[PDB]
Write a protein that binds this DNA or RNA. Structure first.
Ligand SMILES: [Zn+2]
Lengths: 356, 102, 179
RNA sequence: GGGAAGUCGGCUCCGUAACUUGGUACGGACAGGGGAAUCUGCGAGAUUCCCACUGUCCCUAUCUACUAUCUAGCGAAACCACAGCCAAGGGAACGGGCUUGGCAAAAUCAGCGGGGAAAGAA
RNA sequence: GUCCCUACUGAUGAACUCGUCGCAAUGGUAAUUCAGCUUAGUACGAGAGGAACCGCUGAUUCAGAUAAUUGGUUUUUGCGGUUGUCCGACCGGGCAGUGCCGCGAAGCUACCAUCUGCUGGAUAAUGGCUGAACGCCUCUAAGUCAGAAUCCAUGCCAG
RNA sequence: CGAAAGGGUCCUGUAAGCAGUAGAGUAGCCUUGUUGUUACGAUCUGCUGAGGGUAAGCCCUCCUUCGCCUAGAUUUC
């Protein structure tokens, strides 16, 4: 194996952390770096390729794309860090008012038996004229911090998951003075932010996730065989990975009702496969459609972040003309895009007569 | 919607389409699409018999056993007044007419 | 792009789905699934397997003579692009699809035409040969309704009413043994 | 059963007529089978592919034998000076305790591929 | 003819009230080779022949993932066929340590499938600038510029 | 939230039974049959892409049905 992914250990956290935001300069406009989503599955497409110099130039190619359910995230806080001879130090964080039950579930571990008493005194700090103290915290961030991040959480109760506990993370704000970033976050308080607002189509991003576990597995599969340098038996899988350069092909709006329709296929259909995503369900929200395979199982929490470095390739400056998106069943050898197509192909049936 | 637009492309398609609506309108004018208690109750009675046949067959399989087990004869097991009364009642007989014999 | 048809069964063959077999005589064999491919390789007749459009057309399970099927066919002579032509073609495709649906509904109705007469004849025979397994009330029920009809002044309609009630309204196996 | 390797592997007889018992001319027959397919309308049906040996190797198949984590209960033995983290140095191809350095944080579970075993010299 | 401690590899963990969000000392560290297009039948060449920098697109090996598709795998013992025997026969089934055969989702797999692999500084050989030693000269003595797949770091894994 | 059910989606490949003179065949009646009858019957066809399975690591549920539920034990500056 590679001595660069060792100490081959299970990921310390299920969420997966960014570990590096792109470097910040004040000249760029104010923007957010990262976002969150849940892996729904993957499907097949056909792209009219414009790669000047390729043998598939001006030809139709079949590609595999991963679909990420991305309900809008909610901003609930703002954290400010300072530079010290020992690194970055979180000087202070100021939250939003009216936190949601899902983020309070994130804070609690046994939510059902608990008195749900989190951040009540903080809301009283807003309401009872301790807004002087809160403004003092904002001004401390303005006048002492060098980098600002925003606290944001996902919407499980829109995601088709049995879970009810949300996911918090800090998304770094770049491109402006610290005062501009503080005002931006304070204005973003108690507001939903969308994936088409953070990213857009044609843009390569980086995906942070925890790759699927397989338990105690021997050297044959753990490293790929026929001291730390010697292949040993142990945990294989469930590993934190940051996979780079994945092209954002589409962002579907969820309420469009024609997410899977292209300018070539005039079929009013959505991204969800016929019968639903296997083991996941239906995508009823904003979704991100990106090229290739991506670390993580279905319904796993995923972090989507901007590229650290300005790109060096023509694959990152290309437009993606889509021809069609596969919506056949993933539960077996499916050959119909819609139930209407299946009915038109197979005619009417005995149960159709019995019901009608 | 699962069809090839190019396969349907045909110059001078208005004449063929108008012929299609004309022949349709004929089909309605003749009636090609014109859709057209004792039977219900006798079908229900047949369904009731079929249920009874299966419920007897299920009793048959319940006592049958798989491979040739010797069974104490009926003349040797004794059966209760309560059970004989219930079956003969379900069969529609006045049990109160006679039955102090046992 | 284009929607292909499976050689074996006739289901829509979409891009990526299936394996194509190139025979040495020069003809291509496109299948939509591994099932179809393996059936072709074991050399079975789609005209004999009942889940195939070949079999269904041979046995007359589908309509095969109609303008709604003569309107679509493979075109080997191109037509110069024309927005009105394509838009009007799309609208015609919608019209054709719904007309086809209605015609196929009528066809399958005509194929299923005589079923109720056969079912009721079978019911006649079954009831006539098994009159004894019909609902036959209950003896105590009859006695109680006789007393009730004596009270209310009729017996026949009380019967044919509470019989209907009990028929509108299962047996367990065994029972608890007293400890 | 399949794949692989090597090979030098693949692709005359009966009756008839003259001649010295045997030959000579004439007439007829000979010089396949099996399996898998494709094409035309079962059809003289037409066309395509594979048939080997080996004291060789590998894989698949069958049989034989040993193969086994935790819980409840029951329940040994081998072995045991005391111990067990490294690198350099410690004249006697000697280090495990010494010098001086790297360091070094309770209690455990599982895997195990290293160490805790070896000479005696013409 | 002499099953234990430890290293390594993973997994839990007491005390610091539980929890959420982080920082990063230190340790590890990763990409590699080839080809094709344009440059260009150009520079160069009597002829025969014939490059390269920028720019573009693929492939080998290595590494990390992933399962839309496509193969393989079947205890889905899911469905159907079929052998022997048995439940009196039909139906429906048992037994043959999963009888045999065909298809077979899901899951698992496969450079038999697909995706991704990123940028700053300082250097060595060497080539220079200014300029003494030494009234010439000199890349060196003071000072200083560039420069290798090298070195240290970022990106990346652990914490 | 759990168990059923319904719908969807996938897998297999057309259930049991009945009927049609379609039916290769197996036999009786009476006398010649130019169209004789009566029964049984492989196989075929129809009812029947039906029948069965479907999350156990598939999808959805407007009051689809039933049931459950503010617990009980320990520990903490
Ligand atoms: Zn097919």
């Amino acid at each position: 194996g590679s001595l660069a992914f060792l100490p081959r250990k299970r990921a310390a956290r299920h969420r997966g952390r960014v570990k590096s935001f792109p470097k910040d300069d004040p000249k760029k406009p104010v923007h957010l770096t990262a976002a969150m989503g849940y892996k729904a599955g993957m499907t097949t497409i056909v792209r009219d390729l414009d790669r000047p110099g390729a043998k598939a130039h001006k030809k139709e190619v079949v590609e595999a794309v991963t679909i990420i359910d991305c309900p809008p995230m909610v901003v609930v806080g703002l954290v400010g860090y300072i530079e010290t001879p020992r690194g970055l130090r979180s000087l202070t964080t100021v939250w939003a008012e009216h936190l949601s039950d899902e983020v309070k579930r994130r804070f609690y571990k046994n939510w059902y038996k608990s008195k749900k008493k989190a951040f009540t005194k903080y809301a009283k700090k807003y309401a009872e004229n301790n807004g002087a103290s809160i403004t003092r915290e904002l001004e401390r961030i303005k006048k002492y911090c060098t980098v600002v991040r925003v606290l944001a959480h996902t919407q499980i109760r829109k995601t088709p998951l049995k879970q009810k506990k949300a996911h918090l993370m800090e998304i770094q704000i770049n491109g402006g003075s610290v005062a501009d970033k503080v005002e931006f976050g304070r204005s973003l308080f108690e507001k939903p932010v969308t994936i088409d607002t953070i990213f857009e189509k044609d843009e390569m991003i980086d995906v942070i996730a925890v790759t699927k576990g397989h338990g105690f597995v021997g050297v044959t599969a753990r490293w790929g065989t026929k001291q730390w340098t010697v292949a040993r038996a142990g945990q294989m899988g469930y590993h934190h990975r940051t996979s780079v350069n994945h092209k954002i092909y589409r962002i579907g709006k969820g309420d469009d009702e024609a997410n899977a329709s292209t300018e070539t296929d005039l079929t009013k259909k959505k991204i969800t496969p016929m019968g639903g995503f296997v083991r996941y369900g239906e995508v009823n929200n904003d979704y991100v459609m990106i090229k290739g395979s991506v670390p993580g199982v279905k319904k796993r929490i995923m972090t989507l972040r901007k590229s650290l470095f300005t790109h060096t390739s023509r694959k990152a400056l290309e437009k993606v003309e889509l021809k069609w998106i596969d919506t056949s069943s993933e539960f077996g050898h499916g050959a119909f895009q819609t139930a209407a197509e299946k009915k038109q192909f197979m005619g009417t049936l005995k149960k159709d007569l019995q019901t009608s | 919607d699962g069809k090839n637009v190019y396969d349907y492309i045909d110059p001078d398609i208005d004449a063929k389409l108008q012929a299609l609506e004309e022949e349709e309108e004929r089909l309605e004018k003749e009636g090609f699409y014109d859709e057209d208690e004792e039977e219900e109750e006798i079908l229900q009675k047949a369904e009731y018999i079929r249920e009874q046949h299966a419920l007897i067959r299920n009793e048959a399989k319940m006592r049958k056993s798989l491979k040739n087990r010797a069974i104490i004869p009926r003349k040797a097991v004794k059966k209760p007044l309560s059970q004989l009364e219930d079956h003969l009642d379900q069969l529609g007989v006045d049990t109160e007419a006679i039955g102090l014999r046992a | 792009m284009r929607i292909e048809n499976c050689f074996f069964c006739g289901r829509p063959a979409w891009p990526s789905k299936g394996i194509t077999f190139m025979r040495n005589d020069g003809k291509a064999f496109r299948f939509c699934r591994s099932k179809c491919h393996k059936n072709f390789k074991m050399k079975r007749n789609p005209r004999k397997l009942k889940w195939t459009k070949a079999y269904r057309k041979n046995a007359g399970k589908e309509m095969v003579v109609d303008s709604t099927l003569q309107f679509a066919a493979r075109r080997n002579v191109p037509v110069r692009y024309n927005r009105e032509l394509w838009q009007k073609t799309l609208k015609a495709m919608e019209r054709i699809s719904e007309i086809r649906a209605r015609r196929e509904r009528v066809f399958y109705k005509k194929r299923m035409a005589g079923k109720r007469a056969r079912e009721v004849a079978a019911a006649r025979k079954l009831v006539a040969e098994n009159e004894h397994l019909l609902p036959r009330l209950r003896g105590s029920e009859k006695r109680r309704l006789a007393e009730l009809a004596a009270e209310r002044g009729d017996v026949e309609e009380l019967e044919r009413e509470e019989l209907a009630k009990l028929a509108s309204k299962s047996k367990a196996f065994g029972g608890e043994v007293r400890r």
